[PDB]
Amino acid sequence: ELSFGARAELPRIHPVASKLLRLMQKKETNLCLSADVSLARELLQLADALGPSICMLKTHVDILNDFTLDVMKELITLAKCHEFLIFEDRKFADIGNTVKKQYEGGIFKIASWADLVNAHVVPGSGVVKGLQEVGLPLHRGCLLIAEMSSTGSLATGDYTRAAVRMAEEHSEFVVGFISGSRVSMKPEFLHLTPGVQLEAGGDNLGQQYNSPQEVIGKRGSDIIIVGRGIISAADRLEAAEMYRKAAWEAYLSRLG
Template sequence: MEDKLKAFAKELFKIDAIKFGEYKTKIGLMTPVYCDLRVIVSYPKLLETLAELMIWKIGNINNYNIICGVPYTALPIATVVSIKSNVSMVMRRKEAKDYGTKKLIEGVFKPGDNCLIIEDVITSGSSILETVKDLTNSELKCTDAIILLNREQGGEAFLKNNGIKMHALFNLTQLMDILQEANYIDSLMVQKVRDYLATTKVDESLLNKNVSQNRLKMSFEDREKLAKNPVAKRLFEIMRNKQTTLCVAADILSATDLLNFAEAVGPHICALKTHIDIVEDFNPNLIQPLQQIADRHNFVLFEDRKFADIGKTVEYQYSKGLYSISSWAPLVTVHSLMGPGVLDAIKSSDGAKARGVFLLAEASSAGNLISENYTKDTIKMAEQYPELITGIVCQSPLFTNNPGFIQLCPGVQLENKQDNLGQKYNSPLTVVLEKGADVAVVGRGISQAPEPAVAAEKYKKILWNAYLERIKTRVD
């Protein structure tokens, strides 16, 4: 098998899976050698050889009964290993889908199964720990990982410190020796790689910080300290003090009914979401009693305006006119469609000093045209305005490593799955445990209930218990 391993290393070089030059790794380190093992899927015989080598290496690991490849490069490797070894496989999604089973871990398994992790290359080990986290949350045990190539930059020690023992087919130094022996590279390149490895290691303290700061496993108290937006800080404080993550959508047409509704649900919510322009008898005199109710019951007024125009128009819509939103609503929603000018307009407009924005990255309505790239670009835009952005409106856990932002998820209801106008609903448990919501928006499930206060209290308790369930398996 040692000879087979050497022959395999040479084949990797021949298919250009081992490249030499100046490359940047996933974690931002520059490197003179880059291992692009994604190409191996185009060489089935080589993929089969790799699976055989891994099964040989796995021979001294006897405490697993299921395997999982780290997405995405290791998925085909794990599949062939599973077939050739007749060991069951599960598959981890990078994010839960909003259809089908909506699971992060796909496949057949039972709580307590020990899952062997399969990965192609390890630099820091962070990708493996991301997979371990989701497997652990699904009640699987993870103690070992088998790797094709260890880049010798600190990943093995980092995994060990987090309870995972690594088993590698070979390390980067061994790979360089094999390629030099075959006259594929010269001694100068070998020395260059050795010097690089001697001087470039992953900062384990930063890795530990990133692992521990997964917002899905952090308490609101810890996240409050990391929030840069004042409204986000206030929301975190309200949520932990009132033990509620419930935001109620008050789509009510009468000013009197709106005030009565706010008074009824106020003790159970962290925010009241309005569409103030649908109030048929609106008068500016409505605002003061609405603010007094918010102050008395300690919740945030949240106007769901969804600003989406050129900057100057947004400035007027936000701070001028009949509704003068900036003077009374600390929170508003904004579309990223028109670019950062909208956020600049919100930031510089007249009105209350403490203000926050929920930026819309995904929608709960069926058939919406928001694309994956649009969502990613929205997250990037939010990261450029940390003092203004309270959080993101989305339907999946998009920003797990930015715990200062709050995820708002609309469309929550205990019973209905979809209305006749395309609104899709999530259950309270699904929205918190699978979709990553910090704040859940409930509308008609409360506003149309016979006793809105009773319904609000019910949602509050279910959502809060789901949050406690989510953070109890904290990664330290």
């Protein structure tokens, strides 16, 4: 059960995973900040302050009120300074030929700025297909949503197994999973887990939370995706650091 640094250096390691792993190990952070905010200013301000604490800033540009390509440029600037990956959490879930367009074009041009995107496995491997056609090219990686944090989530049993197969049979482009838990023994593969807060509980629309220590330490995940847990806090930085220090020790404690 290697460290992050050792994993970055694994043989079958999408350059995005390694890039990611090299900075988790380097920055002592397995914290992905879910920058769910509607205002480019906020997005960017959290990205800056929180960047050195994070390994990944996750975005929903389709949630961004003042979205412009210029905003991703800036987002990339900070991603590069503070060294975190940009993950656009577009949860692609259409047929190959559509996601292709959805990833590459329209106004979002996700592919031109998102190191990682994720995709739902429902549509079948074609979803990965359509995206790789855009992503592989532009040197991008994808997370497959193998489990979901939310109640009723039908990413279970053989859905999850299928997300795993899909990722394995596409390791060229899939760099990991969105899952609540570790789900591939293949340590080449990242586990990012949403539904993480320091306290217990959920939210009104179906979200379910677990502690970093539970997720990383016990459930064997790599990286915690944390939104309101931090964003809603007053001092998002303090929060981030609390989230950082938490996922990091859970991780260290697992490895020991």
